[PDB]
Amino acid sequence: AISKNLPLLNNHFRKHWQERVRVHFDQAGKKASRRQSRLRKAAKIAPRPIDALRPVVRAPTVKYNRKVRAGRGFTLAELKAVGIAPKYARTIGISVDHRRQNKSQETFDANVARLQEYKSKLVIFDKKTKASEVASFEQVDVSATFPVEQPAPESGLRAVEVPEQTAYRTLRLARNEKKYKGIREKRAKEK
Amino acid sequence: VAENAGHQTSAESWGTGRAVARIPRVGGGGTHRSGQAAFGNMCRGGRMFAPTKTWRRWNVKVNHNEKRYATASAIAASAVTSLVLARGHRVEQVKELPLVVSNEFESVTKTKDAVAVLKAVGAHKDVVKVIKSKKLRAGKGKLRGRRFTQRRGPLVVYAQDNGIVKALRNVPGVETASVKHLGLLQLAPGAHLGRFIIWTQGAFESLDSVYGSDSTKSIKSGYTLPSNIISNTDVTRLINSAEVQAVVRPAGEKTQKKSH
Amino acid sequence: AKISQDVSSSRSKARKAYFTASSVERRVLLSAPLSKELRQQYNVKSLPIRQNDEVLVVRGSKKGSEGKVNSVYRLKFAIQVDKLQKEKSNGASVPINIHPSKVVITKLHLDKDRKALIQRKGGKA
Amino acid sequence: PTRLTKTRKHRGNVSAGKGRIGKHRKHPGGRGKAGGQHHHRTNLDKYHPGYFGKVGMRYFHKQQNHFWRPEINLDKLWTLVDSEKKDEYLSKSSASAAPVIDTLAHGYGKVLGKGRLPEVPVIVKARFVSKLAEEKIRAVGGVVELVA
RNA sequence: UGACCUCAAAUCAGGUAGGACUACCCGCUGAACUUAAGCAUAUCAAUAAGCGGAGGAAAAGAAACCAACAGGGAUUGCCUCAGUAGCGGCGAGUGAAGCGGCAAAAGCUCAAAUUUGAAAUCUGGCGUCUUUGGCGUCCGAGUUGUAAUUUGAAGAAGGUAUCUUUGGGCCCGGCUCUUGUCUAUGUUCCUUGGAACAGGACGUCACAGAGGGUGAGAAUCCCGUGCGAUGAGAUGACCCGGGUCUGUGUAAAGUUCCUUCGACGAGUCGAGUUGUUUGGGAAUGCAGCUCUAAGUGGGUGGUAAAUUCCAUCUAAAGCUAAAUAUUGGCGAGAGACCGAUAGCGAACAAGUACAGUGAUGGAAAGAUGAAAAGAACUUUGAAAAGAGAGUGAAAAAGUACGUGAAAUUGUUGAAAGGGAAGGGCUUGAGAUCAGACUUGGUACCGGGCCAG
RNA sequence: GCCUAGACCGAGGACUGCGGUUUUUACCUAGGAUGUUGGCAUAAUGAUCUUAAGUCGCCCGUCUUGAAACACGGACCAAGGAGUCUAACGUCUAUGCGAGUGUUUGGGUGUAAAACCCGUACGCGUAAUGAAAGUGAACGAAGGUGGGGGCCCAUUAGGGUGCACCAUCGACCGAUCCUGAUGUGUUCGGAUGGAUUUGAGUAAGAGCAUAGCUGUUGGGACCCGAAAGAUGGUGAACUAUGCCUG
RNA sequence: GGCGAAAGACUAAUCGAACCAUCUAGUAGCUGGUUCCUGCCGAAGUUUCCCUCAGGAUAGCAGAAGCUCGUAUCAGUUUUAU
RNA sequence: AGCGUGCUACUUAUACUUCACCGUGAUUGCUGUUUUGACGCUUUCACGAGUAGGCAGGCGUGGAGGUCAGUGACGAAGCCUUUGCUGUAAAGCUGGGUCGAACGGCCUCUAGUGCAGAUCUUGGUGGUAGUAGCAAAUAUUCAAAUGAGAACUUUGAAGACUGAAGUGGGGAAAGGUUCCAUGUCAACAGCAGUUGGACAUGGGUUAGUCGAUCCUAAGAGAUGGGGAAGCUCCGUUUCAACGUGC
Ligand SMILES: CC[C@H]1CN2CCc3cc(OC)c(OC)cc3[C@@H]2C[C@@H]1C[C@H]1NCCc2cc(O)c(OC)cc21
Ligand SMILES: [NH3+]CCC[NH2+]CCCC[NH2+]CCC[NH3+]
Ligand SMILES: [Mg+2]
Ligand SMILES: [Mg+2]
Ligand SMILES: [Mg+2]
Ligand SMILES: [Mg+2]
Ligand SMILES: [Mg+2]
Ligand SMILES: [Mg+2]
Ligand SMILES: [Mg+2]
Ligand SMILES: [Mg+2]
Ligand SMILES: [Mg+2]
Ligand SMILES: [Mg+2]
Ligand SMILES: [Mg+2]
Ligand SMILES: [Mg+2]
Ligand SMILES: [Mg+2]
Ligand SMILES: [Mg+2]
Ligand SMILES: [Mg+2]
Ligand SMILES: [Mg+2]
Ligand SMILES: [Mg+2]
Ligand SMILES: [Mg+2]
Ligand SMILES: [Mg+2]
Ligand SMILES: [Mg+2]
Ligand SMILES: [Mg+2]
Ligand SMILES: [Mg+2]
Ligand SMILES: [Mg+2]
Ligand SMILES: [Mg+2]
Ligand SMILES: [Mg+2]
Ligand SMILES: [Mg+2]
Ligand SMILES: [Mg+2]
Ligand SMILES: [Mg+2]
Ligand SMILES: [Mg+2]
Ligand SMILES: [Mg+2]
Ligand SMILES: [Mg+2]
Ligand SMILES: [Mg+2]
Ligand SMILES: [Mg+2]
Ligand SMILES: [Mg+2]
Ligand SMILES: [Mg+2]
Ligand SMILES: [Mg+2]
Ligand SMILES: [Mg+2]
Ligand SMILES: [Mg+2]
Ligand SMILES: [Mg+2]
Ligand SMILES: [Mg+2]
Ligand SMILES: [Mg+2]
Ligand SMILES: [Mg+2]
Ligand SMILES: [Mg+2]
Ligand SMILES: [Mg+2]
Ligand SMILES: [Mg+2]
Ligand SMILES: [Mg+2]
Ligand SMILES: [Mg+2]
Ligand SMILES: [Mg+2]
Ligand SMILES: [Mg+2]
Ligand SMILES: [Mg+2]
Ligand SMILES: [Mg+2]
Ligand SMILES: [Mg+2]
Ligand SMILES: [Mg+2]
Ligand SMILES: [Mg+2]
Ligand SMILES: [Mg+2]
Ligand SMILES: [Mg+2]
Ligand SMILES: [Mg+2]
Ligand SMILES: [Mg+2]
Ligand SMILES: [Mg+2]
Ligand SMILES: [Mg+2]
Ligand SMILES: [Mg+2]
Ligand SMILES: [Mg+2]
Ligand SMILES: [Mg+2]
Ligand SMILES: [Mg+2]
Ligand SMILES: [Mg+2]
Ligand SMILES: [Mg+2]
Ligand SMILES: [Mg+2]
Ligand SMILES: [Mg+2]
Ligand SMILES: [Mg+2]
Ligand SMILES: [Mg+2]
Ligand SMILES: [Mg+2]
Ligand SMILES: [Mg+2]
Ligand SMILES: [Mg+2]
Ligand SMILES: [Mg+2]
Ligand SMILES: [Mg+2]
Ligand SMILES: [Mg+2]
Ligand SMILES: [Mg+2]
Ligand SMILES: [Mg+2]
Ligand SMILES: [Mg+2]
Ligand SMILES: [Mg+2]
Ligand SMILES: [Mg+2]
Ligand SMILES: [Mg+2]
Ligand SMILES: [Mg+2]
Ligand SMILES: [Mg+2]
Ligand SMILES: [Mg+2]
Ligand SMILES: [Mg+2]
Ligand SMILES: [Mg+2]
Ligand SMILES: [Mg+2]
């Protein structure tokens, strides 16, 4: 049962696995039908874009802090800053998120600029609007017209300024202070 | 095969002691199926050994760069007359390869006009080869929607389609292809190099943008045409050159004389 | 080549649709070409064969024979012509069955519906 | 392809390469990793020492995002400078104007100190650096700027 | 003499449920074979069988979420995380989630509020009309609470600068679905053949050289194919484009600011214990029993506890398309699949014949010929049949039907044969086959084979 | 030294060589058979089949130390009949690119399951080590010594340079143990110098991907084969026993 | 489970636990079989561990692929010295 | 022609020697004459046992891409055959006969790809073998009729038996047309057949009084209720407001 110098394997095939084998023979068929659904949905509502405008948000965790991506909806504060009520915004292609808030100014300002850019390119029709004006427009792709753009990393030339304390020493001292903060505070309180 | 084929029986082995093999047997009585062997790959009406499954591997991955390597090699082979002739194309009356035709042939809309152009440019003897090559397929594949076989004709490559695809659609053996989307199934049919390709002028001039050159970057992202491992592919002149022949020792006899 | 996704190139499906065709479908299946004279007279090239048409046999051992259709025997996929008979050693005569595609119509049996059909097909009645 | 397999070559020979004495059987020795302490001990001790037993402390609900910190060495640090401006930076770089290398924005957590730098000032922005990496960066007249 | 409450009866007026199908779906219940080279925890498996309940999808779903970031933001699925953290006689084994890329995206509703200057709400009967309903009226329900108003993202009541938006019904189109009708070019010549659909010659059409039929391989004989054109029926508060009639818009809704408020789900949360389950480990979920709350309270923050903070949501009430699943149903298109002992058990009057008391079990079986032209008639025979004849391209195709192998068998011919036969080697005999007078060159030159 | 009888064979296919005789740039017996004669080509000759004779020859397959066995299967014939596919892997090989590599979850596109195109992420690799907190790879020409193919200078030999690789002594990184500078939230920090210790490490990257054979593990798992176990159902027309009615 | 004047008897030719279908192609260190040709190479029944003794793993024996080199320094042998 | 011993000759293994041929391994040379095969040609030497097993090169089969503008109704495929040829072989090709609609060579791809065995599977067929056998229940015979045909049918005559607890005359269960008439003999009636419970065509079962139907028996089982997740279990007037009353 165990023989030769081989890696030890974990092949989880002791259940009735053959009754639950999903082979994706329909990958191409699903691609084509997905494209047809996408075309029909666009042509139904043209020239209105098929995608609602989405915000830009920082990705969570220490591993994806650096990246920025499309969020779910603009916060109520952001829409307040651009003077759009959420109920109205949902009817002009803007997504709303009551759950997200703005602790910091950077994401708030980015999304306010994004909303103002969309509002400048928005044209809302009405009863007085004729089919000549409606036909004068093309169905744009909002996800590409207002793309999520990563802030550029700092590069180029800058003056070198060398502090007396090294960066490694700074990190070591920060670690030590965090590690012994509680016991040092207890000792000082007792003293 | 069906997942339950050969297994729709309640057959049970009789065991030993009844002077018959220990294969499972059908129970009951009153029919001739009763007492007959079941479930075995050797048994009439049993299931096959290792019944075929749908989760067999059907599609095969090929590295994109290697696939492009092969596409470039097949395109290059289309310009070698010996390869096209060994490939079987009736190209003896074409004055040079590649065969490039003017762009008016991108706009012919009738099959009659397209056939006239093929005749004019010398590519209709290969169509006649396709016509004369029609045979009933040998084997049971003719019961499966593959009833006739025939040769492959010229591949006509265009840059703009103004009716050429439909004009050549019904001509037997002729394939049409945009210069933007060329693949090995058309460029080397049967894995055999040397497809007879008729280029329109637009397609021929677009080739250099599609695959790039030393002065033009390819439209394919980050793609460069491959490099050969040998610079002079004619090794006879390398061997019989001044540089090599000036430093070699004199040759012996083609056949050693028998001395004992 | 066929383009429609509603058209099948299956040999088994085509043969099943042929051999299980209803009598009404077999009426269309048993079409015959018109002679050159009727083709230029009516500007129609083929019609479903009918009972009282006159035909000329153009293929087979009875090629050159002429006669009036006696029955469109749709069950056997054949027509029986007036005097195209095989004489058994019994002495009795049985009609010879001929496919309508192996004859040409030389005289049409006309009525209001045949005329409407000819005008429908772009012809002149 | 099956035509290349040795099953095609064993046709006509009685045992199909399995032997007349051994008689290819269902599961002699057990299934899987059976008998790893009893009759497959000679195999596991020889080829997989350390297999049995516990070492170290458990960690309930370990989130690997916490430990994300890709390394970049100093001999690979100048590959983060723009290729079109690398030679100009390597020539015209000084204390007054040195290239900034944002390692976090390129996907690195710690700067390590293997290799040698060009004797050219650089400003390195990192979450973490090693002691020798920062000593070597300062020696060429550069600086390490801690970020988060 | 009458209310009310609770509970009954009626063949009272009008409704509704049950049962079926099985592939997917929501739950309950629940093994063992098996693996551990034995075996009991474990594994198989939170699987099979059993039970209850749906739909075209179901379920889930707009955080009592994830996190620990510079924060994300309903649900679902894919790729990845990851055979990882973890669980495990820490053995065999097993094993998720957050982040990230994508498919699809859609949001919301009650309870808790005095309408209190007016139960403003609703089922039903009766009448009537333009009838998936409107109007009128009368009982009834209902104050032990039916409407409007609000749902935490808020919101209410006052004050406030004013601004921005807007209801419904029919008629023709478009889109979607189904369906009817209509369409290019040889049956020209020769040969073979029973038949031309074969070969050859000359051609034609081609946005049609897919497929099928017709007496053999037919683009051009027929149906179709390709290209479109043009009618009919449907369907859609919840698709738009136009018309047209009513809009009862001091109405409804949003927007800024100030003040006062801001109700928010209990045998529930939570705790103990028991059983089961989970990767969940001093206990992941579920369930039983015991205990049983609170109001900046409550839950969660993956090591039990007390103390102090912090973060994040807001349970114990509810609805909701899409992306996802689909050995079933309905309709289609296909294949490097099988080719009648194969492929479904079933290509056929197959779940048939037949067996079994019963649950159940369950076959074998395709092919004359282009066409029955399925052999008139004569003769022998009791008849079946035979012999002539006849049809057919063929009867070396006669339904005991294409081809018609082997085992086994008859006849004819050849040969051998004292208690087996068969085999190898070698030669004889007999039979069969082969080859140089060559693709010989001009009486001769020369050659081939076997020999001295 | 000389004479003399017989048998089997004749590979090769212009010349080239070594010798010999030299009367000779000629000849020979000297790097493998030629000459001549007869017969035959309706045939002498060769092959096969059948058979006789001589001689030898036990029934195959199987397990087994040992089978013709008085061991097992096999009356005969036809058709069917047994190492497969998949998930994850080891070695080797081929191929593409290469400090990168992998288009195909998806998107674009299409003559529509094809072919063609696109990119973020992600996987693997480019860093290890420790249980972990954590730390994290140049004294030197990326080291010395002995070899080392090849190259350079030579001219037997000899010198120079020596990649891969081998043996050996070192250096660097992590862990373990020891020492403990300036300093300090006075308990932290950890410079510096060491140690018969230890790592699947560094020491001018080698990997990633596809495919093939072979091997591995889980799967019905090369094919056929239990005695059993479990879940849900069907039987008292036989029979056992009670009851009711004859 | 039944039933048993008791034999483990009988419970539809089935009884020391009926019959039917399914789990199920249950597992088998055990028996049987395992399908074309030629060419080249060619074993083991021994070591150690195992509820191990009809079985495995391990080492040995064997094949294949090669790689670095090219007489370098090898040997189932002798001689001489010890 | 025995035993001990010496000598000469002679006999013959797949062994040894020389030579031919096959293959394997090594080895010589081959590009200004390499020259449309250098994966080729060529020189030389040695070697050849083999189970289990490994590897290599080939033969054959179904299907797929390409090619031979391949074969074919003037005969494809299949099958039979001392018609032969080629290959060490797996096999390939071919003459004749039969037959009637498709099929092959080559470069590649692919696999449900090769049978003598598995008390293998399904179908078919032998020897045994014209063999075992067709022997319980007393028993048949003569004549005529019918018929192609009579041991077996019909009629007559006789001889017998069952012997009223029947081989008689009815029924219950069970069968289902077997009943009756006419025709009829392919199969069935283990000989026969003119006969038949066979085969074919028709005909045939008449109820107020005979049964069923109704009653209750052992028992079965709704309702009201009570269990049970539930399939359903209990209970039979039970903790019930129980009359479709007369
Ligand atoms: C053998 C195939 C059957 C069985 N299966 C499986 C179960 C099932 C269940 C269904 O509902 C649960 C159902 O509903 C439609 C259909 C079916 C089908 C029906 C099908 C026959 C049906 N095929 C289509 C046409 C047709 C025409 C007829 O004349 C006709 O005669 C009876 C029947 C039919
Ligand atoms: N999943 C089917 C088997 C059910 N067996 C339950 C698993 C028992 C193991 N519990 C894990 C130990 C508790 N942490
Ligand atoms: Mg089958
Ligand atoms: Mg074939
Ligand atoms: Mg083997
Ligand atoms: Mg064996
Ligand atoms: Mg073994
Ligand atoms: Mg032990
Ligand atoms: Mg009523
Ligand atoms: Mg199992
Ligand atoms: Mg076990
Ligand atoms: Mg076992
Ligand atoms: Mg056991
Ligand atoms: Mg189930
Ligand atoms: Mg339904
Ligand atoms: Mg859906
Ligand atoms: Mg739902
Ligand atoms: Mg909420
Ligand atoms: Mg979420
Ligand atoms: Mg589990
Ligand atoms: Mg009313
Ligand atoms: Mg045809
Ligand atoms: Mg709440
Ligand atoms: Mg517990
Ligand atoms: Mg449970
Ligand atoms: Mg618990
Ligand atoms: Mg809720
Ligand atoms: Mg379906
Ligand atoms: Mg079948
Ligand atoms: Mg069958
Ligand atoms: Mg037949
Ligand atoms: Mg014939
Ligand atoms: Mg015939
Ligand atoms: Mg026949
Ligand atoms: Mg025979
Ligand atoms: Mg005798
Ligand atoms: Mg002989
Ligand atoms: Mg002879
Ligand atoms: Mg010779
Ligand atoms: Mg002998
Ligand atoms: Mg044996
Ligand atoms: Mg044995
Ligand atoms: Mg023995
Ligand atoms: Mg033997
Ligand atoms: Mg013996
Ligand atoms: Mg015995
Ligand atoms: Mg035995
Ligand atoms: Mg026997
Ligand atoms: Mg066979
Ligand atoms: Mg990457
Ligand atoms: Mg680490
Ligand atoms: Mg290294
Ligand atoms: Mg047990
Ligand atoms: Mg009874
Ligand atoms: Mg007893
Ligand atoms: Mg006893
Ligand atoms: Mg019994
Ligand atoms: Mg019992
Ligand atoms: Mg098996
Ligand atoms: Mg079994
Ligand atoms: Mg054993
Ligand atoms: Mg050997
Ligand atoms: Mg044994
Ligand atoms: Mg003597
Ligand atoms: Mg000899
Ligand atoms: Mg050998
Ligand atoms: Mg062998
Ligand atoms: Mg196949
Ligand atoms: Mg031909
Ligand atoms: Mg033939
Ligand atoms: Mg035919
Ligand atoms: Mg071919
Ligand atoms: Mg097979
Ligand atoms: Mg056989
Ligand atoms: Mg065998
Ligand atoms: Mg047998
Ligand atoms: Mg048999
Ligand atoms: Mg006898
Ligand atoms: Mg007897
Ligand atoms: Mg008497
Ligand atoms: Mg008596
Ligand atoms: Mg009686
Ligand atoms: Mg009778
Ligand atoms: Mg008889
Ligand atoms: Mg008889
Ligand atoms: Mg009868
Ligand atoms: Mg009575
Ligand atoms: Mg009673
Ligand atoms: Mg009851
Ligand atoms: Mg009840």
UniProtKB/TrEMBL annotation, chain A:
<keyword id="KW-0687">Ribonucleoprotein</keyword>
<dbReference type="GO" id="GO:0006412">
    <property type="term" value="P:translation"/>
</dbReference>
<protein>
    <recommendedName>
        <fullName>60S ribosomal protein L13</fullName>
    </recommendedName>
</protein>
<dbReference type="GO" id="GO:0003735">
    <property type="term" value="F:structural constituent of ribosome"/>
</dbReference>
<comment type="similarity">
    <text>Belongs to the eukaryotic ribosomal protein eL13 family.</text>
</comment>
<dbReference type="GO" id="GO:0022625">
    <property type="term" value="C:cytosolic large ribosomal subunit"/>
</dbReference>
<keyword id="KW-0689">Ribosomal protein</keyword>
<dbReference type="Pfam" id="PF01294">
    <property type="entry name" value="Ribosomal_L13e"/>
</dbReference>
<keyword id="KW-0479">Metal-binding</keyword>
<dbReference type="InterPro" id="IPR001380">
    <property type="entry name" value="Ribosomal_eL13"/>
</dbReference>
<dbReference type="GO" id="GO:0003723">
    <property type="term" value="F:RNA binding"/>
</dbReference>
<dbReference type="GO" id="GO:0046872">
    <property type="term" value="F:metal ion binding"/>
</dbReference>
UniProtKB/TrEMBL annotation, chain B:
<dbReference type="GO" id="GO:0005840">
    <property type="term" value="C:ribosome"/>
</dbReference>
<comment type="similarity">
    <text>Belongs to the universal ribosomal protein uL4 family.</text>
</comment>
<dbReference type="GO" id="GO:0046872">
    <property type="term" value="F:metal ion binding"/>
</dbReference>
<feature type="binding site">
    <location>
        <position position="79"/>
    </location>
    <ligand>
        <name>Mg(2+)</name>
    </ligand>
</feature>
<dbReference type="GO" id="GO:0003735">
    <property type="term" value="F:structural constituent of ribosome"/>
</dbReference>
<keyword id="KW-0689">Ribosomal protein</keyword>
<keyword id="KW-0687">Ribonucleoprotein</keyword>
<dbReference type="GO" id="GO:1990904">
    <property type="term" value="C:ribonucleoprotein complex"/>
</dbReference>
<dbReference type="GO" id="GO:0006412">
    <property type="term" value="P:translation"/>
</dbReference>
<protein>
    <submittedName>
        <fullName>60S ribosomal protein L4-B</fullName>
    </submittedName>
</protein>
<keyword id="KW-0479">Metal-binding</keyword>
UniProtKB/TrEMBL annotation, chain C:
<dbReference type="GO" id="GO:0015934">
    <property type="term" value="C:large ribosomal subunit"/>
</dbReference>
<dbReference type="InterPro" id="IPR041988">
    <property type="entry name" value="Ribosomal_uL24_KOW"/>
</dbReference>
<dbReference type="GO" id="GO:0006412">
    <property type="term" value="P:translation"/>
</dbReference>
<dbReference type="InterPro" id="IPR005825">
    <property type="entry name" value="Ribosomal_uL24_CS"/>
</dbReference>
<dbReference type="InterPro" id="IPR014722">
    <property type="entry name" value="Rib_uL2_dom2"/>
</dbReference>
<dbReference type="InterPro" id="IPR008991">
    <property type="entry name" value="Translation_prot_SH3-like_sf"/>
</dbReference>
<protein>
    <submittedName>
        <fullName>Ribosomal protein L24</fullName>
    </submittedName>
</protein>
<keyword id="KW-0689">Ribosomal protein</keyword>
<keyword id="KW-0687">Ribonucleoprotein</keyword>
<dbReference type="GO" id="GO:0003723">
    <property type="term" value="F:RNA binding"/>
</dbReference>
<dbReference type="InterPro" id="IPR005756">
    <property type="entry name" value="Ribosomal_uL24_euk/arc"/>
</dbReference>
<keyword id="KW-0479">Metal-binding</keyword>
UniProtKB/TrEMBL annotation, chain D:
<dbReference type="GO" id="GO:0005634">
    <property type="term" value="C:nucleus"/>
</dbReference>
<feature type="domain" description="Large ribosomal subunit protein uL15/eL18">
    <location>
        <begin position="71"/>
        <end position="145"/>
    </location>
</feature>
<feature type="binding site">
    <location>
        <position position="17"/>
    </location>
    <ligand>
        <name>Mg(2+)</name>
    </ligand>
</feature>
<feature type="region of interest" description="Disordered">
    <location>
        <begin position="1"/>
        <end position="43"/>
    </location>
</feature>
<dbReference type="GO" id="GO:0003723">
    <property type="term" value="F:RNA binding"/>
</dbReference>
<keyword id="KW-0479">Metal-binding</keyword>
<dbReference type="GO" id="GO:0006412">
    <property type="term" value="P:translation"/>
</dbReference>
<protein>
    <recommendedName>
        <fullName>60S ribosomal protein L28</fullName>
    </recommendedName>
</protein>
<dbReference type="GO" id="GO:0003735">
    <property type="term" value="F:structural constituent of ribosome"/>
</dbReference>
<dbReference type="GO" id="GO:0046872">
    <property type="term" value="F:metal ion binding"/>
</dbReference>
<feature type="compositionally biased region" description="Basic residues">
    <location>
        <begin position="20"/>
        <end position="41"/>
    </location>
</feature>
<dbReference type="Pfam" id="PF00828">
    <property type="entry name" value="Ribosomal_L27A"/>
</dbReference>
